[PDB]
Design a protein around this ligand. Structure first.
Ligand SMILES: [Mn+3]
Lengths: 1024, 258
């Protein structure tokens, strides 16, 4: 293929002239930023781009500019195209290893100044932190080299090419290559120089090239440790190295964005609290091993660090170069079948975090990454998986300092090889225990393809060698969803040679033939349990443990049943936790035309909005946080189920159990919320518990002092005693009032002092109910009892298909008889309505009796619903009344769960209490769907201006409710597409279907499903 | 439907017309049989239901027509017809094989072939004909992804299954990816030969065609040889269609076909 350049279709051309990967250290004196405006032009394909060996700055000066770093699909007015979203499918034809012939090619150009002294004093390099997909590099019209690996770095020696005065850098960037085949992550396709570019000036005669730091405990009791520091010095003109380790700074250290990101400085004295000092001797190995007496451990719960300074020293005893970094005393092992850190079998409370920003894409400001991690810490997360590639190199000090268990992952995904296979065989489902046989079929294309070995090894080598020295990283991962083949085995051998100190993960390798860990994604409990049992021998020993590298798919309303996963995690030593997918929605900000308004509004794009030929729609929106990286109810729920302290209140006792891996409860203040006075809780070690006699209902565990990025008073855990359903002390007026009953041909009236009740007998509709200045009426379309909800993302693949199939949205009430009698026991009147509630097309439905017992200040509504007929649905979304609220309506207040929404399998984070609608910002989903329900509601007060409250309570069971404004939710593509009525309604529900995680994972669990059955429930409408 | 149920069969082969009465009751008497090649009528014996006759004839095309107004039908109304099968004859077009001086310009992206009354431009990156103007008549490829396309707007019948397959296999998103273009001077009366090697395959998929398009350019004619080799795993069962799409020049007014 001579119409496609050789290097874009050669899997072995991983780079040309790239320097060997070394440990990353930012140094202000060495690093000089080349970020900013660059000359830029885009071409249809390589053959339209100029020859860079002949490109003048005088010519490039005339082009438009683009700012580095940024993606070229994310510019003002979509100047250079729009983002493309695909999940599994490749957006190109599969013709390995050829990219498409029409291959967007972007040429970047800028200049920089070089001194006379500069070229003499320094070795000059260019370092590119990330360029997608690949590029060739030119300096002063001379070819320097080539590079592949979008999320990896690259350094090139530039010394031969530089001149005094102006220097011209030209980068030719290509969108597609043979590399595209191994970069098929479920994310946006975005191109360009999206990470920092730097000019490096290293001391010329000698400099530090690489450093290796390891900490190995000498002993099984993890006290004394050996600190090993090996240095690679390049050049002859040096004497020796010095090394100073400083006194530790406890992991409880207070940070903020400013101090975490501070990059200074040359004259800045790193530290002076010396602990250990070592010097090398002239002509001796520039490495050493030191015994360290009982050092403070580095742990994710307590990220204690020892700062160090490494000095390269010349003959005259002057400092040639310094490295200022840190040591975290930590050892990871596979021990008795568990992932072990300092001897302890840890629990992952994790997420997958992609690089994403709603405006900049994968070009994420560090400021924003810090924001992410502070939020994670604020919500009890202790681990992150770098799905599915290494991040910006500066991010790893953030993990080190804040404390996260980190899975650093190779930039390698091959998923798309399956798509044609899936479609050709009409595959419906993949299961963690069996799906590997399906991937085995196509592994020969890439992961079992010898032509790709060099590329695969490069992804491994680049991954490990850049980030080796970060204590936060405990696991290397070979990539994601790339099938299984010989190349993976090769990667495993190499990584163990390069870095024996860590463990290797790869989920595509079911049996872990070349991994140290087992890993499932989105497994069913039964599937987890099968695996556990088949890998635990008769003695109870297992060789390797199980983690869930992805689980509890956080797409939209959900995920349900995080609780049940957690119970499983705590019960078996074999399970060591999981990482939920995903941290945040990948929404891109854009201008949307409103379906509600006809006008232009800000929205967040998912597949289809940028009009891709092929895309995967709303699967972009699968985070615990929204596109703006703010918490959803998903994150709120996750924080609760993973809380590292259990507080159980029953039988006049509070039981507190420490569920941390390492730290004590000493940092926590326990408050009795009923009294406000604190509770003396003994210092609890991991897994230790205590029972304290108490009359309390509600206990909170809170931070005593600012520590890390958390503030004093920040809630870590809490518990409540279960709250019995109490009938409010409402006094029903049973005194005898004269009442006019008018039973007309169609309408029935009941009028009394302060009361007006009108029912349409033909429809079963309440035309108007006005009691003491407060009015409601039925929100009626076909039926007075309704069943539909705007489908969640989880509802879509199955439950919605069923509910639509059975016409649940078209349920009709057909009145058979209406009975009107005078009041009995204090009653004004009794109106009884007999009907069948059934959808068009169908036999199935409910023989329904609605008995309205009318009192002067209260209306008792008894509902009896008998499920009858053949060919029934399995379940319903919902069941209850819809009422229009009067013009007077202003706000509401409830006793039950809050402050936020709650659903059967997503409710426990929402503690019991008295809540006011005025105190709550109701959550707006990036993709409109079922929202705003409140489950386990004891009572609900609806406030009407100038007329007090209407109290609503269900007899003998808590109920569900939603008060809103909104409709057209099913078909609104974005928040701004949601329509709004001129009045509010109450959705008053006996029961509601759970939420689950079926968009990717298990269906709503049995105990949370709203199964088809008879319904019988009684409500009181009490008017103040 | 009118044709398949015609109540008289007319079969023309081997210098013979065979006429079979396929009515249930009536005779062929009411019918006039015309030899369409000559315009003169054919004497056909009165045929009863299921009776037939073979008549020697050089005819290619025989029509059965109503003699007189009868019922709600008019004299001359066509009831049945037959044709002899028509062999494919190459038109007697004379290709100009005389030696004309021709300028061939093989640029970085575009290839030009210019001669007296001829202009051929191909985009080598796309495999697209930018313009073909010969003797005042211009065409160019109607191009979106590929110079050879496969899609059709689904019929009602296509919808329940065939369309589901064709959409599933992204046949509507078939792409042409050019691998090599070869430009050589004309040989046997030829002005130039431009050969295009490509893979025609849809996004997402392995399957596709290893394609060779050979354009042999003469002064008054362009021979287009297409070779399409089906390659790769996970293929569709069938396609809606296969062929070229060309924009017609502003001059275009009408068409005629045999
Ligand atoms: Mn919209």
């Amino acid at each position: 293929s001579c119409l496609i350049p050789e290097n874009l279709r050669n899997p072995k051309k991983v780079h040309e002239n790239r320097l060997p990967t070394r440990a990353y250290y930012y140094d202000q004196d060495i690093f000089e930023s080349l970020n900013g405006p660059w000359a830029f032009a885009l071409f249809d394909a390589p053959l339209d781009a100029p020859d860079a060996k002949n490109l003048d700055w005088e010519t490039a000066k005339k082009w438009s500019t683009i700012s580095v770093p940024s993606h070229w699909e994310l510019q003002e007015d979509w100047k250079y195209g729009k983002p493309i979203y695909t999940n599994v499918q490749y957006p190109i034809p599969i013709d390995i290893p050829n990219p498409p012939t029409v291959n967007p090619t972007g040429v970047y150009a800028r200049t920089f100044e070089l001194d006379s002294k500069s070229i003499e004093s320094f070795e000059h390099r260019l370092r590119f932190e990330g360029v997608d997909n690949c590029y060739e590099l030119y300096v002063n019209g001379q070819y320097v080299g080539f590079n592949k690996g979008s999320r990896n770095g690259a350094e090139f020696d530039i010394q031969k090419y530089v001149s005094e005065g102006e220097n011209l850098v030209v980068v030719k960037v290509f969108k597609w290559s043979d590399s595209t085949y191994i970069e098929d992550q479920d994310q946006w396709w975005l191109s360009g120089i999206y990470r920092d570019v730097s000019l490096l000036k290293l001391p010329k005669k000698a400099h530090i090239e690489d450093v290796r730091v390891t900490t190995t405990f000498v002993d099984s009791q993890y006290q004394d440790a050996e600190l090993s520091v090996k240095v690679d010095v390049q050049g002859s003109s040096y004497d020796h190295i010095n090394f100073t380790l400083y006194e530790p700074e406890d992991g409880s250290k207070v940070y903020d964005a400013s101090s975490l990101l501070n990059e200074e400085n040359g004259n800045t004295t790193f530290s002076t609290k010396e602990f250990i000092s070592f010097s090398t001797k002239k002509n001796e190995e520039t490495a050493f091993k030191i015994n360290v007496k009982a050092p403070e451990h580095w742990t994710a719960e307590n990220p204690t660090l020892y700062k160090y300074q490494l000095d390269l020293i010349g003959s005259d005893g002057s400092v040639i170069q310094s490295i200022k970094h840190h040591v975290g005393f930590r050892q990871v092992e596979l021990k008795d079948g568990n992932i072990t850190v300092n001897g302890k079998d840890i629990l992952f409370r994790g997420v997958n975090r992609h690089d994403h920003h709603p405006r900049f894409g994968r070009a994420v400001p560090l400021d924003f990454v810090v924001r992410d991690l502070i939020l994670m810490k604020k919500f009890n997360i202790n681990a992150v998986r770098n799905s599915h590639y290494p991040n910006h190199p500066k991010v790893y000090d953030l993990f080190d300092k804040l404390g996260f268990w980190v899975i650093d992952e190779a930039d390698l995904e091959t998923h798309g090889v399956q798509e044609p296979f899936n479609r050709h065989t009409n595959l419906e489902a993949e299961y963690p225990d069996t799906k590997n046989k399906l991937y085995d079929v196509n592994a020969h294309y890439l992961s079992d393809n010898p032509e790709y070995e060099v590329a695969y090894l490069d992804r491994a080598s680049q991954l490990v060698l850049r980030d080796v020295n970060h204590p936060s990283i405990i696991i290397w991962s070979l990539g994601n969803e790339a099938c299984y083949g010989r190349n993976h085995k090769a990667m495993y051998k190499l990584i163990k040679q390069l870095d024996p100190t860590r463990l290797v993960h790869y989920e595509g390798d079911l049996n872990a033939l070349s991994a140290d860990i087992f890993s499932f994604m989105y497994p069913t409990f039964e599937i987890m349990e099968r695996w556990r049992k088949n890998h635990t021998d008769e003695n109870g020993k297992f060789e390797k443990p199980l983690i869930l590298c992805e689980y509890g798919h956080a797409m939209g309303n959900g995920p349900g049943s995080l609780k049940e996963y957690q119970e499983l995690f705590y019960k078996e030593k074999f399970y060591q936790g999981g990482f939920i997918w995903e941290w945040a929605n990948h929404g891109i900000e854009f201008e949307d035309v409103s379906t509600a308004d006809g006008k232009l509004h800000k929205a967040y794009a998912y597949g289809g909005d940028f009009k891709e030929e092929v895309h995967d729609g709303v699967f972009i929106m699968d985070g615990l946080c929204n596109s703006e990286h703010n918490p959803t109810p998903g994150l709120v729920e996750y924080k609760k189920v993973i809380e590292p302290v259990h507080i159980k209140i029953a039988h006049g006792s509070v039981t507190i159990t420490n569920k941390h891996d390492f730290i004590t409860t000493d940092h926590l203040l326990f408050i009795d919320k009923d009294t406000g006075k604190t509770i003396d809780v003994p210092s609890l070690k991991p897994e230790e518990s205590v029972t304290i006699p108490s009359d309390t209902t509600y206990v909170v565990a809170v931070l005593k002092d600012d520590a890390g990025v958390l503030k004093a008073g920040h809630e870590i855990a809490w518990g409540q005693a279960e709250l019995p359903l109490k009938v409010p002390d409402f006094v029903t007026e049973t005194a005898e009032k004269a009442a006019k009953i008018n039973d007309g041909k169609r309408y029935v009236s009941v009028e009394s002092s302060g009361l007006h009740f009108i029912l349409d007998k033909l429809l079963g509709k309440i035309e108007s109910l006005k009691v003491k200045g407060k009015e409601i009426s039925s929100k009626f379309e076909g039926s007075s009892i309704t069943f539909w909800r705007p489908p969640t993302n989880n509802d879509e693949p199955r439950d919605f298909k069923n509910w639509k199939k059975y016409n649940i949205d078209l349920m009709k009430q057909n009145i058979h008889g209406v009975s009107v009698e005078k009041g009995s026991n204090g009653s004004l009147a009794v109106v009884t309505v007999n009907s069948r509630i059934s959808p068009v097309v169908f036999y199935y439905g409910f023989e329904t009796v609605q008995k309205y017992t009318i009192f002067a200040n209260k209306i008792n509504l008894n509902t009896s619903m008998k499920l009858t007929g053949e060919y029934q649905p399995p379940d319903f979304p919902r069941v209850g009344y819809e009422f229009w609220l009067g013009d007077s309506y202003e706000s509401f207040e409830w006793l039950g769960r809050g402050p936020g929404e709650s659903y059967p399998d997503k409710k426990e984070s929402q503690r019991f209490g008295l809540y006011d609608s005025k105190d709550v910002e109701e959550f707006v989903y990036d993709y409109p769907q079922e929202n705003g329900n409140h489950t386990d509601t004891h009572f609900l007060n609806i406030k009407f201006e100038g007329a007090g409250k209407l109290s609503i309570f269900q007899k003998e069971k808590p109920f569900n409710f939603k008060i809103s404004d909104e409709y057209g939710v099913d078909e609104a593509a974005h928040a701004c597409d949601v329509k709004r009525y001129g009045r509010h309604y109450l959705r008053l529900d006996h029961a509601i279907h759970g939420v689950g995680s079926e968009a990717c994972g298990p269906a709503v669990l049995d105990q949370y499903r709203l199964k088809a059955q008879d319904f019988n429930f009684e409500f009181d409408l009490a008017f103040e």
